[PDB]
Symmetry: C2
Subunit: 215 residues, 2 copies
Amino acid sequence: PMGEMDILYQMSLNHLAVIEADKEVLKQVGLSLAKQEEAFRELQLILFNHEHSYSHHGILGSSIEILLHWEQNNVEVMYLETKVALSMIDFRRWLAYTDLLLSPILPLGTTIELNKDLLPAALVTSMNEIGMPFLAIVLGRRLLLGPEDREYIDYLVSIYPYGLRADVNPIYISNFFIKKVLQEGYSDAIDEQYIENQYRKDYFSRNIVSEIYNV
Amino acid sequence: MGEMDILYQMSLNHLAVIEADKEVLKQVGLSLAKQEEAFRELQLILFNHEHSYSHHGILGSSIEILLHWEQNNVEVMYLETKVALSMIDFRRWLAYTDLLLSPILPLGTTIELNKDLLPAALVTSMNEIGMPFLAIVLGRRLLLGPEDREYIDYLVSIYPYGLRADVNPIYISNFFIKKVLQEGYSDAIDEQYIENQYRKDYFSRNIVSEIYNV
Ligand SMILES: [Cl-]
Ligand SMILES: [Cl-]
Ligand SMILES: [Cl-]
Ligand SMILES: [Cl-]
């Protein structure tokens, strides 16, 4: 069912200097990325590593192809035989508010497996061994950075099975670090209401987005 | 397993009692450890300096404990037997029972806390909307600085805020827990870590829960 987040998302699309016909396909690409978590993580990693090409076809929607022309500071997005040109700053802002308003947020206490390839080698070697999945527990969510609170980081996690220790400090991770969700934590209407009001509505009102986008 | 049972037998040699009394305390300790709510009740009675404890949840025979605070000793009645313990040995017996036999919750478990055992200001906002005090287990059996001679059962974050900079986590004893809503993930890696670190290692270093003040 259509909800308040869809309204805020349309408002964010109205900041893009682009045609209504092109706003419509960016809306559909963003909704598709939001529903396919692994697809979005792949795109988030491509933007972070300054890769130039993205192609994904999940089990849900159509194929999404994006060419990131970093030298020209612009981007091409193609969905359903329709091609859209965006500046790089508009591309980052579009994905930022797609992530902010539409990406699922895991419950507290969720156990996840981290992608070893993306973690620093010193952390993998000291806190993990070969053949054991790098498991972690979600401790905090969308945490505000610095005194100015202009960006957030997706998760703060502890390393399983150690948890929070004086020796074992927790780890700030972005969502694309997550390889798998093993078991979700507890969540009820209180959590859903808090997430909607604080991590989406309030952040949107203050232009607070995830740090990986650098708008 | 049998390893943990032998460790519990060995811990009873820290008590200044006859051997016949150790066998009775071993049975009552295993009884308490297997009934978490009953053990939590006795821990709160010890914390509150209360006088009498009775439990009948065992299929065979009730258990009655009398705390004689002025005489600085304790009476444990079981199966029409009576063991007299000093207050210091009573605390030691419970501490090693807790250390070696009490279940330990998985990380990420969501629990409901007893509001009456929490600071009044801390529970006000939950009362104001009629919601229970829910928390998430972040850390377990944490060492208490600077000596690191005793441990605290759990370190928890307030639901649904989680761990923040505006909201600091809370240390709680096991007897704060009113209910377990949903256990976090746990497998053989966790079970081996818990046994090696939080039971075997702590036992060889004489690290017990702070609530017993041994
Ligand atoms: Cl924060
Ligand atoms: Cl800053
Ligand atoms: Cl950690
Ligand atoms: Cl907290």
